[PDB]
Amino acid sequence: MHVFPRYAAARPEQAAELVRSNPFALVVSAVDGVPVATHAPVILEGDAVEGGTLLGHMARANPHWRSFASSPDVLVVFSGPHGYVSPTVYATDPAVPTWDYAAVHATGRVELAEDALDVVERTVAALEAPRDPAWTPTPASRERFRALLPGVVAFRVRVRTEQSMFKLSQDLDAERYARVREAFAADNPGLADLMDRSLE
Amino acid sequence: MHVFPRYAAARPEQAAELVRSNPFALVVSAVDGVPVATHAPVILEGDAVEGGTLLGHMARANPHWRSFASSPDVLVVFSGPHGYVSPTVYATDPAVPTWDYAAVHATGRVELAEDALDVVERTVAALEAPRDPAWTPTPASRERFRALLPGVVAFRVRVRTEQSMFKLSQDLDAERYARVREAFAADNPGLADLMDRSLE
């Protein structure tokens, strides 16, 4: 990912906000020289992605984690709201299409996490926190977590590098920007809300 | 990505349908040994992902494409609709959360595409095809495409391997499945439509 300066975050806190708000990430490493990726929930420990640690889990039956010891460089991609920008919306000619999106990429050293129960329970808490109502696990559910635990592999990534981009049409003139924002308001409220929040 | 058999596509055509319907992909390769990923629109040439060719573009100012010659193994990830499944929705105890999603991963050899104008114009056609109304480029827009062309790098991937997963709660009993489907109907119609289409 190349971060074009015109799409840099306006505030440094935006990157960790995106990460916390979009935890279903892509965990990428090399296996036999080819990138392989697993879709998995990953949470952040730390006030920032830089200097932070990421914690996730996958199925033990997914062999991806077995390659971590010999190929430990990982990339984790967090993808926020996104949407195609058609020239139909611009209503200007000549025009070129684009795609709007926000993302945070973090790279670092992966290690298997022995404290898998703590990782999955903290993942529950982080993914339920923005919900209304939120689910909290009963003792019976926690007992079931202990029965499920042999089938899970948890992991930690100490973040070495990080980048973020908020490609949200903010380089447009006010007239076309309003057209883009209003078209997403109806078709993609998550992206429209991200645009609004990235202006307040 | 490990494809759990219970989440395999019901029909072989579903993978290419997902790819065509979700062209904003993640293009991943190794650069200095670490995975790096660019978010870019990628289209499919062929009736299937297997035996197919993928075609995309990125900015010339994005240095990712410069690593293609020495590290040519690429992974392209197409991500369809997705959404968190909270135990709140199940209304059963004990429970464990999950995430529902569909994705197609394709790996192969990348090569730079000399026919960049054709790649970007076919990308316009593919991304406008499902829209109503669709935008077609006027001669003035095509003239502008020619002025923009020096700033773009196009590329091709001959697909060597492919996998797809449709993790859409279809392993649940009818009662919980209806609860999941109805909760997404209101909060995530794209995912609910994908679930429905993956049942017809």
Ligand code: HEM
């Ligand atoms: C919000 C919380 C959670 C989410 C979104 C989530 C999501 C997921 C996903 C997407 C997978 C598949 C990973 C892969 O492809 O390898 C998975 C696997 C798994 N998770 Fe979680 N999970 C959550 C919490 C938990 C908890 C609390 C436990 C308790 C131990 C748990 C146990 C497991 C197990 C056993 C598997 C493997 C199942 C199998 O082999 O089919 N997860 N989870």
Ligand code: HEM
């Ligand atoms: C539906 C069609 C299209 C979509 C969704 C799209 C999307 C994108 C995206 C996401 C990027 C940034 C890539 C990166 O991060 O490296 C990009 C770059 C670029 N695209 Fe496209 N594009 C489309 C069609 C076109 C067409 C028809 C042209 C005409 C030549 C074009 C020319 C360019 C150029 C010049 C750049 C680089 C701009 C810069 O350096 O800032 N694109 N496009």
